[PDB]
Amino acid sequence: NTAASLQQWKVGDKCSAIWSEDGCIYPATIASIDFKRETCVVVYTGYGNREEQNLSDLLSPICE
């Protein structure tokens, strides 16, 4: 994980998010960010769902 940059993300960046449904970590890609709410919508890669997560709650992209 990239701890130092774990609050700032940009649209089009890959990440990991906590799926609200399993509570588990899954790979997701940032589709859009609302910097005012400090949240962003991410699309779960491989699944095709999109969920709104906090920028500071996002997790580093999977590479393994």
Ligand SMILES: C/N=C(\NC)NCCC[C@H](N)C(=O)O
């Ligand atoms: C981010 N993860 C997912 N979707 C966006 N997973 C969908 C399949 C897993 C789900 N627990 C099931 O078995 O239905």
